[PDB]
A paper describes a structure:
The human [name]+ [name] p97, also known as [name], a potential target for cancer therapeutics, plays a vital role in the clearing of misfolded proteins. p97 dysfunction is also known to play a crucial role in several neurodegenerative disorders, such as MultiSystem Proteinopathy 1 (MSP-1) and Familial Amyotrophic Lateral Sclerosis (ALS). pmcp97 is a member of the classic clade of [name]+ ATPases and is an essential cellular enzyme. p97 is composed of six protomers forming a homo-hexamer with an N-terminal domain (NTD) and two tandem [name] domains D1 and D2 (1). p97 is an essential protein in regulating cellular homeostasis from membrane fusion, Endoplasmic Reticulum-Associated Degradation, Mitochondrial-Associated Degradation (MAD), Chromatin-Associated Degradation to NF-κB activation (2). Here, we present cryo-EM structural analyses of four disease mutants p97R155H, p97R191Q, p97A232E, p97D592N, as well as p97E470D, implicated in resistance to the drug CB-5083, a potent p97 inhibitor.
These results imply that the mutations decouple ATPγS binding in the D1 domain from inducing the structural rearrangement of N domain from the “down” to “up” conformation. D592 is located in the pore loop region of the hexamer at the inter-protomer interface, indicating that interactions distal to the D1-D2 interface can also influence the coupling between these domains. While p97D592N mutants appear to result in a similar disruption of ATP-induced conformational changes, this does not appear to translate to an effect on the rate of ATP hydrolysis. Our results indicate that interdomain communication between D1 and D2 domains can be influenced by distal interactions communicated to the domain interface via allosteric effects.
Residue numbers in the entry:
A (entry chain C): 21 to 707, 728 to 768
B (entry chain D): 270 to 707, 728 to 768
Amino acid sequence: NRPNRLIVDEAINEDNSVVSLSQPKMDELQLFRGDTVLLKGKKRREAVCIVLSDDTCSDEKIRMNRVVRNNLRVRLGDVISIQPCPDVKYGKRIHVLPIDDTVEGITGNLFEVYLKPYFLEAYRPIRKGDIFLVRGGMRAVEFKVVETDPSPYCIVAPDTVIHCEGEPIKREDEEESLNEVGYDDIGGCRKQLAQIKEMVELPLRHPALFKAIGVKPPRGILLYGPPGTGKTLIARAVANETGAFFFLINGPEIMSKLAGESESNLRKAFEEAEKNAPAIIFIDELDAIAPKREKTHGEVERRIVSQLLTLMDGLKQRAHVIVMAATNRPNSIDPALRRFGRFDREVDIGIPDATGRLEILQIHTKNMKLADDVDLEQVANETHGHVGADLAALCSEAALQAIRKKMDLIDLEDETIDAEVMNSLAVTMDDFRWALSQSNPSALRETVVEVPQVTWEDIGGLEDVKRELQELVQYPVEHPDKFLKFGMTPSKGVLFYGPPGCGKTLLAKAIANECQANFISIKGPELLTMWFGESEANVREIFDKARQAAPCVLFFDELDSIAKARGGNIGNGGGAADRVINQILTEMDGMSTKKNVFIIGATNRPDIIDPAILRPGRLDQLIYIPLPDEKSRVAILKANLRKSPVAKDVDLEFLAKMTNGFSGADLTEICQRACKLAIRESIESEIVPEIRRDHFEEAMRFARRSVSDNDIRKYEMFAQTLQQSRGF
Amino acid sequence: NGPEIMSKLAGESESNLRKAFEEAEKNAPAIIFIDELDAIAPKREKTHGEVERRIVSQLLTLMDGLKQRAHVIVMAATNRPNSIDPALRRFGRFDREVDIGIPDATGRLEILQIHTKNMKLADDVDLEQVANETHGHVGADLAALCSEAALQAIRKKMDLIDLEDETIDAEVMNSLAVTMDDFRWALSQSNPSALRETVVEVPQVTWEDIGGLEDVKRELQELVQYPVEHPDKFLKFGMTPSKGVLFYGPPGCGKTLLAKAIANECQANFISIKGPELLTMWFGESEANVREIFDKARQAAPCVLFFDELDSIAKARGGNIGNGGGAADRVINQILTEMDGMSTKKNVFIIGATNRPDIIDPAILRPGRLDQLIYIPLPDEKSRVAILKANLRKSPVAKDVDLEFLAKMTNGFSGADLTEICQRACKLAIRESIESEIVPEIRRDHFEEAMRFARRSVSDNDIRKYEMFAQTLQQSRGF
Ligand SMILES: Nc1ncnc2c1ncn2[C@@H]1O[C@H](COP(=O)(O)OP(=O)(O)OP(O)(O)=S)[C@@H](O)[C@H]1O
Ligand SMILES: Nc1ncnc2c1ncn2[C@@H]1O[C@H](COP(=O)(O)OP(=O)(O)OP(O)(O)=S)[C@@H](O)[C@H]1O
Ligand SMILES: Nc1ncnc2c1ncn2[C@@H]1O[C@H](COP(=O)(O)OP(=O)(O)OP(O)(O)=S)[C@@H](O)[C@H]1O
Ligand SMILES: [Mg+2]
Ligand SMILES: [Mg+2]
Ligand SMILES: [Mg+2]
């Protein structure tokens, strides 16, 4: 019915007004690639734009830029009306004006810096009263045409003239300031944003329908994660991207008040939220006001917690009020809040990965002007423990370093500097390198949940175990139909055992990568150092974090360190299977099979592994990784020498047949030593850039075997008899 | 409401409690419900403000001043019963305690029906399957799951059908139906709250899931079913039934399955406490949780309390000798105390299982604690056929598969080993199907290939040692 209603969501083209459609859509509306289109919105106002031909987006969804959502007064998920007008329209005179909210502190002719390299070679349309934003001069200005030839009858053409005024127009309250945070201002959290949208937009955008349908809304969203991960940013963006009244409660600000006055503040907050339409209450830093009532001193604090619980419980569905809260210490929150009816939805705003932090870097540098040598992808790769706040600080420091080299070379001593020199200020990759040099990552200690970068190509040989890992991991998650047809429940666990340096860690990471599943690595020393504080909840938290990351692989590396805590099965006579390992067994037994969490254990001490690991249902797929044979050694050398300029005379299979008892680590050490000899040769010759046959000969001269023949025999013995182990 | 009372100022919450009790006494037979009792009445030893202690004392005074003539019944709800001040749980204040435990599969199916009765479900919706697939869910979790499935159904109908009307009519609401895929999606995104909680239920495994072991099945029937089904014979002959059984033998021979199956046949509640669970609850030095296990078994009578993987417990300090000190410590002494402190007339039966009879501490084996020593050996040739048949019930096995051929080709294999063989053959069949897609019957060739890599999980020396302990384990104690 009425094939002209289009559903609106956030766009993917990071530019000015360019709408994107789906495969049935350009055929249904018979519109071409570079077509001028007219968009019709609510409140009797219009927008003219350019279509973008997209097919692999969805079945029916248009993609709308935040620049032109405000031109139509339409928000996310709203319905829009469209009308193709494939007529070329050229404007003669456009009377254009800035706004005195984003142009303060900037003087001169802002057109030669903003509107010149934004108009030409674009051919974009302009309508009456359109607020379009141009980024430049390490800042962003939204801009307003106020007078021109009849609307729209305007696209960007060279015959369109420009004129400087210097008189910005005041911003009325009818339109929303684009400088405010939106969904385009968050990077690295799209799954979490998707969950937040699914929980929030329907109750708020459609309150009457939701109330009439009589179903429970999620009213207890609790955002949590490490500090500086965008929790406040996400909450304020969700507030802005919906037409919901937003009341903010600050933990410290509430607790700074006198006794009996903070309770009044909470009551007034909830009363105002109930009064003012669908609304969002955001309690930032919830742990400030609501710590655990068992661990707290003053009775005023306990009254605060009880008052918050009462207000949460007295929140009815008829109120159409959604309460979000943010805390970076979710375990310090009083448990009564995290129950049903108060805070039942929990969203983990985790540390961004490499792609996510690259997106954050782009979001923070979009206003900045970067030199051509700036590789934001490289910066994202080189930043590991950084969070969104860390990346914003890094970008700010790089910008300030660039300024420091331009405030002295160019005397910027003028009181209010113009943009004619601000564009000349550019941030080089060296500035980013310097900023990265002086930067303290906050989330270094945090566990990493990401898809690892290592592929099968980084692993030499081991084809059989690659196939077995594929069958054990990929097939249950890719073809559940076969498993349910044949009735067999997939095994949830694999134990890697064998001599050291044979690729046990690489195999787990690579099988994580091929499935494109999240990977969590918990090393034995990490467990033994978290447990020394007698914190039984952190090992539980590891399995919890793996649960929300499904499909995920939970890899316990270096189990030998765990099994060597008290020596082993005998050890001092008492069992080294204690502390964490019993809790690990309990967590393995307490996780459902239908969950896509796969557990992999690795150890190079199969003698002292406790039998309870090997029980069916915990880790019963015993995979033995042996020393590489002659062909696997060639493969390992090829994999390790991918990044090095190896000379053509190097005979890799000669090295493979000259190394017999060497592991993958030993061959990597040989390659590293030969590369280091090449580096030394280059250094000496400076006072050639190809690692040669002679370097490998010299490295092989000092090459050493890290696995004994007795060790090989014992590993082969355990390779045959480790299923027995348990029992005696 | 606990928090609502505690949110008031000092001296005003006491007034609220007094007014509540006065109104209840005034208005006929009445019920006072104190929701979240732990909010207002924590342990007076562990509390800070004197206002809170006055609140607790006022509640105690009001409970004690409640006369029979008042016809007032006070109910209270708490999810932390052990945090309640002990003075409240005594006679005259709160003497009746009801444990609203986690629902089982049938109960959670009933909850799903109660929450979906208003909803319109498609014909593919199998609420029984959803109940089976939800384990740690409680009634609130199931209500949330149903609500999320309904909202997922709406999301696929608010866009396909423009429901943009302000007040939608029912002529299209009926057209909105919740499919089994919506329930599957909701179950995919759902966090069960009671995953860590102990499960008290009748297990699903029957005798048909166990191959062979007919003699131990009969012995378990005599030990468990007869005392609870025919007490008259036992009182006629004057013998008190033994309250305990210890399962010992090589690993993977069905010790867990036997306990669960004997629980199922009696239709009795089953509680499984594994050794690692005990060793991880005890690391917090919580001596009350192991007591709580026996308590929970007491209200679940007739119940079977199964302690699985006692080898892990006995390996905490190595064993009887171990490091020289005794590995019988921590939980095991409290387990012995709890076993000795439970009345015989209670229908709680205790079963222990271990595959390390060498390091089991003798105090377990004392008459009155676990004196029925049942040895589960490796399956023999016919029991292997039975085990293979039991494991292949759910798989489409081809007719050419010779099960007794596999049984006679496997000699030292346990039930776990045969299950591993079946799983490997099934996985080869899955691989064949995957390859052929780019037939739906596990064949003789698959079993041949699986048997090619089949492995024996019990050594001949282990078999000899288990046979030695099968004959001499009653001795054990003494030296
Ligand atoms: N994911 C992100 N995407 C973009 N910018 C981000 C992101 N995370 C943080 N930032 C930036 O870093 C700033 C840090 O503020 P927030 O992360 O919102 O504070 P927070 O997340 O509540 O952490 P707290 O308050 O210290 S516990 C934000 O204002 C953004 O400028
Ligand atoms: N099959 C292999 N192919 C390529 N490189 C390998 C291989 N095996 C080992 N290496 C190298 O040796 C390093 C150690 O590999 P790991 O996966 O950690 O092996 P491991 O079995 O965990 O033994 P350790 O204790 O980690 S040295 C890798 O980072 C590689 O540089
Ligand atoms: N008699 C049997 N009949 C059928 N399946 C069996 C039998 N014995 C063992 N199995 C299989 O092996 C698995 C383990 O059985 P359990 O009852 O756990 O034996 P167990 O003596 O407790 O030894 P573990 O330590 O649990 S492997 C079961 O889940 C079945 O798949
Ligand atoms: Mg914040
Ligand atoms: Mg490693
Ligand atoms: Mg078992």
